[PDB]
Amino acid sequence: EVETFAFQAEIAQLMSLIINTFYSNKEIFLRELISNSSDALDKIRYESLTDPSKLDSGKELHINLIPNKQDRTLTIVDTGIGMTKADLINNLGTIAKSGTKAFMEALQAGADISMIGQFGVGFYSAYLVAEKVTVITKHNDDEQYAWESSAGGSFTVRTDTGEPMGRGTKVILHLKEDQTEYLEERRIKEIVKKHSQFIGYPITLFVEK
Ligand SMILES: CC(C)Nc1cc(-n2c3c(c4c2CC(C)(C)CC4=O)CCN(C)C3)cc2c1C(=O)NCC2
């Protein structure tokens, strides 16, 4: 079954601002999502030091970038801690509420959209380039879930019926028609080198056959 939820008022406001504001420096979405993945990887790595059985769901700690020109999708796969049903519906939304408020106040005070990460709401920069975002996730303590939103004030959460992941998160960016440059090998390499060169996990770009 598919459950539909309204985003927190502040989050819905941020999403509308990200989608409607004229801002050409859209490439920052990739460093924001890579940073989210890197943070999830740090979390599982740290937890595994006191409980090694937390890595029974996969020992490899990495990030994979998968562009798909046919489907017009850019997929970011990590083997991080993953997210529970509570994280997707309540927890992360509650955490994001305060940062979203602070970021929108900062934007009114002179700050630019690239500073989104300093407020811990960088995930939402995915909407600079994507018309729809699908998040497939698996945490050791819960089932595999699929979160999805095309903005408009709502998101859906369902138990994922697809291919089992083991542990981690897949962020599927259903790109806007004019944002296909982020599917080009050369462009992705340039973004990773400029903004994510010092990420402490291997970042593998999957080249299209
Ligand atoms: C284990 C938490 C910290 N990893 C993540 C958390 C988010 N994330 C975050 C936020 C949100 C999301 C994803 C979302 C779909 C739940 C929406 C949201 O508000 C707000 C606060 N941010 C600090 C993080 C996104 C991702 C991840 C992840 O594991 N991999 C990549 C995608």
Side-chain angles (χ1 to χ4, degrees):
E1 57 140 47
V2 182
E3 289 184 292
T4 308
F5 306 88
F7 278 108
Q8 285 262 39
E10 297 76 11
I11 313 303
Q13 215 178 126
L14 181 55
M15 290 175 83
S16 297
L17 189 149
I18 291 162
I19 291 156
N20 305 139
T21 308
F22 181 84
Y23 187 77
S24 300
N25 187 35
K26 290 173 183 285
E27 68 178 59
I28 62 96
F29 83 90
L30 191 58
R31 64 134 197 260
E32 293 312 319
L33 296 166
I34 288 170
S35 294
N36 288 150
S37 289
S38 185
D39 291 353
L41 288 160
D42 287 344
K43 289 190 207 298
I44 193 64
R45 186 182 57 170
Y46 170 81
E47 280 197 10
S48 79
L49 301 178
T50 53
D51 188 12
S53 75
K54 283 179 176 178
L55 293 180
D56 288 352
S57 53
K59 292 261 185 286
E60 295 167 273
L61 305 177
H62 62 248
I63 303 161
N64 294 155
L65 305 180
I66 313 163
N68 188 326
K69 280 171 185 174
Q70 192 181 259
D71 300 354
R72 208 203 303 149
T73 66
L74 177 66
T75 302
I76 302 147
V77 182
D78 70 64
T79 51
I81 197 160
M83 288 166 281
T84 62
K85 202 189 176 188
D87 285 332
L88 297 171
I89 300 160
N90 297 105
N91 303 344
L92 297 161
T94 301
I95 293 306
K97 199 179 180 179
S98 63
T100 294
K101 269 209 80 172
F103 180 49
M104 290 189 299
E105 282 166 10
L107 288 157
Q108 284 169 45
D112 81 288
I113 289 165
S114 75
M115 292 163 187
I116 193 159
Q118 278 201 83
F119 302 90
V121 293
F123 171 79
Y124 292 101
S125 68
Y127 289 92
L128 287 167
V129 298
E131 58 181 26
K132 184 172 80 180
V133 182
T134 308
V135 175
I136 313 292
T137 192
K138 176 74 177 74
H139 186 278
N140 286 335
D141 301 346
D142 217 335
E143 291 294 307
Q144 185 161 306
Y145 298 99
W147 177 103
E148 194 171 80
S149 184
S150 291
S154 68
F155 65 93
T156 64
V157 181
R158 72 191 78 182
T159 56
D160 191 61
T161 55
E163 184 63 30
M165 287 177 73
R167 189 204 59 253
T169 304
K170 284 184 188 185
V171 176
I172 309 155
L173 308 167
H174 297 86
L175 302 183
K176 293 171 195 181
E177 211 177 300
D178 71 322
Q179 301 303 322
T180 68
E181 69 189 272
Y182 303 110
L183 297 174
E184 237 74 46
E185 184 192 343
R186 243 163 157 206
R187 185 75 173 110
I188 308 153
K189 280 179 175 175
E190 184 192 34
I191 303 155
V192 172
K193 190 184 170 71
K194 186 182 175 182
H195 302 289
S196 311
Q197 68 178 314
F198 302 130
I199 293 294
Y201 302 97
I203 299 166
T204 309
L205 175 50
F206 279 34
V207 290
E208 287 205 86
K209 299 176 298 299

